[PDB]
Amino acid sequence: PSVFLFPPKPKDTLMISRTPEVTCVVVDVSHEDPQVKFNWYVDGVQVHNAKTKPREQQYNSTYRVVSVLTVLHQNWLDGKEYKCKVSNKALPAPIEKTISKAKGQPREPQVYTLPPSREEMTKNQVSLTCLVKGFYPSDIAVEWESNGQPENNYKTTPPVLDSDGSFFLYSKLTVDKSRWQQGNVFSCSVMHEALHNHYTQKSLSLS
Amino acid sequence: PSVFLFPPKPKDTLMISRTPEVTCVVVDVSHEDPQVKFNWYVDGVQVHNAKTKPREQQYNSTYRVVSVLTVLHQNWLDGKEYKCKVSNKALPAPIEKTISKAKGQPREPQVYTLPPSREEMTKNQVSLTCLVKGFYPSDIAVEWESNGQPENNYKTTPPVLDSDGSFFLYSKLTVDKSRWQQGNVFSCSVMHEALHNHYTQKSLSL
Ligand SMILES: *[C@@H]1O[C@H](CO[C@H]2O[C@@H](C)[C@@H](O)[C@@H](O)[C@@H]2O)[C@@H](O[C@@H]2O[C@H](CO)[C@@H](O[C@@H]3O[C@H](CO[C@H]4O[C@H](CO)[C@@H](O)[C@H](O)[C@@H]4O)[C@@H](O)[C@H](O[C@@H]4O[C@H](CO)[C@@H](O)[C@H](O)[C@@H]4O)[C@@H]3O)[C@H](O)[C@H]2NC(C)=O)[C@H](O)[C@H]1NC(C)=O
Numbered sequence: 001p002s003v004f005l006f007p008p009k010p011k012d013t014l015m016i017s018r019t020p021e022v023t024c025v026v027v028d029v030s031h032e033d034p035q036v037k038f039n040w041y042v043d044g045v046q047v048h049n050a051k052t053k054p055r056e057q058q059y060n061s062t063y064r065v066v067s068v069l070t071v072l073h074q075n076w077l078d079g080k081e082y083k084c085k086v087s088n089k090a091l092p093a094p095i096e097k098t099i100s101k102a103k104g105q106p107r108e109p110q111v112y113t114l115p116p117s118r119e120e121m122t123k124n125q126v127s128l129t130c131l132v133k134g135f136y137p138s139d140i141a142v143e144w145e146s147n148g149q150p151e152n153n154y155k156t157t158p159p160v161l162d163s164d165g166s167f168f169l170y171s172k173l174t175v176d177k178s179r180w181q182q183g184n185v186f187s188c189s190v191m192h193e194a195l196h197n198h199y200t201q202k203s204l205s206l207s
Numbered sequence: 208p209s210v211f212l213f214p215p216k217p218k219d220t221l222m223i224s225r226t227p228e229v230t231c232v233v234v235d236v237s238h239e240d241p242q243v244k245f246n247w248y249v250d251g252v253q254v255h256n257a258k259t260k261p262r263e264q265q266y267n268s269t270y271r272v273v274s275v276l277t278v279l280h281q282n283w284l285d286g287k288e289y290k291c292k293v294s295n296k297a298l299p300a301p302i303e304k305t306i307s308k309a310k311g312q313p314r315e316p317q318v319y320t321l322p323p324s325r326e327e328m329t330k331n332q333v334s335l336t337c338l339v340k341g342f343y344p345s346d347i348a349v350e351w352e353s354n355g356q357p358e359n360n361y362k363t364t365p366p367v368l369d370s371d372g373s374f375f376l377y378s379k380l381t382v383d384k385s386r387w388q389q390g391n392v393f394s395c396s397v398m399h400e401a402l403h404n405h406y407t408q409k410s411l412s413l
């Protein structure tokens with residue numbers, strides 16, 4: 001039996017309207033003794049069944065069970081630990097897994113847009129670059145937009161640990177060379193806890 | 208008694224002068240029964256040996272044995288498969304692991320240098336950006352230099368799959384703003400199999 005603990009999506013902890021959740025998944029549960037017991041704790045507290053919510057599901061020759069715990073935005077941002085305890089009779093001792101926001105002081109992300117290289121202009125599609133650096137923790141959300149509509153032909157690298165101990169990443173938005181020199185304006189949105197309203201936006205366009 | 212096969216460093220296989228190698232790591236070796244016997248095969252052949260060489264041990268609470276096999280640059284680029292057979296008494300049957308370079312038409316990387324944003328011109332240090340996209344397979348090596356000398360403060364993101372099936376990455380070199388204002392020339396070096404001579408350079412300066 002193996003247990004996996006997943007943190008909330010970065011974007012869920014940053015918007016009050018969204019529902020951030022910590023997901024505890026157990027696999028290789030005995031096909032013979034599928035009864036699984038879950039206990040959740042926040043900073044060591046609440047053996048006593050609280051919120052949470054399990055389900056179940058049969059697989060190869062085993063069972064898979066998932067429990068989801070809704071977390072409070074500020075609880076997560078304040079570094080509270082979420083512990084998932086899993087018990088099964090076909091197991092010696094219960095399996096424990098804990099997860100929290102990475103420790104350290106939040107650092108505000110620096111966002112800069114970079115137009116495509118002149119040499120790339122011979123191509124039919126160009127690259128609009130958004131650089132995000134100096135941020136911490138690594139949890140972050142980046143998106144693009146031209147008008148109000150979201151742009152979807154973009155790719156973002158995973159965050160990279162930098163020398164100062166902070167993280168950086170780049171996002172690449174690909175558009176038709178025409179849409180660019182025509183004058184259209186683009187912008188990458190960046191969501192991070194260390195930003196004023198957990199959100200900033202930088203514009204990009206030729207001139 | 209777990210086995211992990213690793214491929215050669217991208218750079219080692221692109222320059223004849225270097226020595227590319229495939230490495231077969233063996234973790235959780237029983238403190239009781241180390242004695243690990245390796246077996247390597249290149250496209251099936253070998254075992255009556257040809258160039259293997261294991262070494263060292265011990266770790267946290269268990270042993271870690273590692274076998275290194277030197278490869279012919281050409282054999283690795285041609286897509287030959289490398290197989291590591293690991294044997295140990297405390298292991299029922301011999302665990303085998305195969306490895307080879309990603310398959311598919313190699314694609315030439317486009318290299319573009321991007322100057323620091325006007326907005327960043329306010330910090331003491333600035334970011335020189337090297338965008339490398341459209342390449343395949345993902346094995347690539349990127350480096351920065353200035354007037355013939357290698358730069359120290361740069362970081363390269365790992366390869367990211369692009370929408371069209373090829374890869375891209377960004378390399379970032381941080382330098383004192385003065386060095387950029389003084390007009391010094393900085394260069395992004397890229398090493399990939401689909402480039403003529405497996406190498407290309409792109410310069411940046413104010
Ligand atoms: C004794 O210590 C061993 C290693 O100890 C080091 O690493 C940590 C354990 C540290 O806490 C500290 O103890 C030491 O610094 C333990 O063995 C480890 O076992 C795991 C899985 O059993 C291996 O994980 C693999 O890692 C490779 C990547 O390796 C490279 O990167 C790491 C760092 O990121 C380096 O340390 C390595 O040298 C390599 O450069 C993965 O590619 C590999 O693939 C995955 O396999 C798992 C299956 O387990 C899949 O689920 C995934 O999808 C992937 O396919 C795998 O993740 C560690 O490499 C290995 N440690 C090393 C480096 O040899 C050992 O467990 C511990 N006690 C025991 C149990 O004896």
Ligand SMILES: *[C@@H]1O[C@H](CO[C@H]2O[C@@H](C)[C@@H](O)[C@@H](O)[C@@H]2O)[C@@H](O[C@@H]2O[C@H](CO)[C@@H](O[C@@H]3O[C@H](CO[C@H]4O[C@H](CO)[C@@H](O)[C@H](O)[C@@H]4O)[C@@H](O)[C@H](O[C@H]4O[C@H](CO)[C@@H](O)[C@H](O)[C@@H]4O)[C@@H]3O)[C@H](O)[C@H]2NC(C)=O)[C@H](O)[C@H]1NC(C)=O
Pocket residue numbers: 002004027028059060061062064
């Ligand atoms: C029996 O069947 C189980 C479920 O079957 C899945 O597999 C395929 C082949 C079909 O059989 C389908 O029915 C079904 O998709 C198998 O369970 C699997 O067990 C592995 C562990 O051995 C789990 O892997 C873990 O995944 C984590 C990420 O999960 C998320 O993403 C995957 C897609 O990539 C989704 O499916 C999940 O739902 C999640 O959204 C990953 O974080 C874990 O990695 C971490 O831990 C390892 C150590 O184990 C470490 O090396 C690594 O660095 C990380 O720290 C880990 O890889 C897998 O999730 C689970 N399958 C599913 C769908 O939940 C079971 O193995 C199979 N056979 C046996 C012997 O039981």
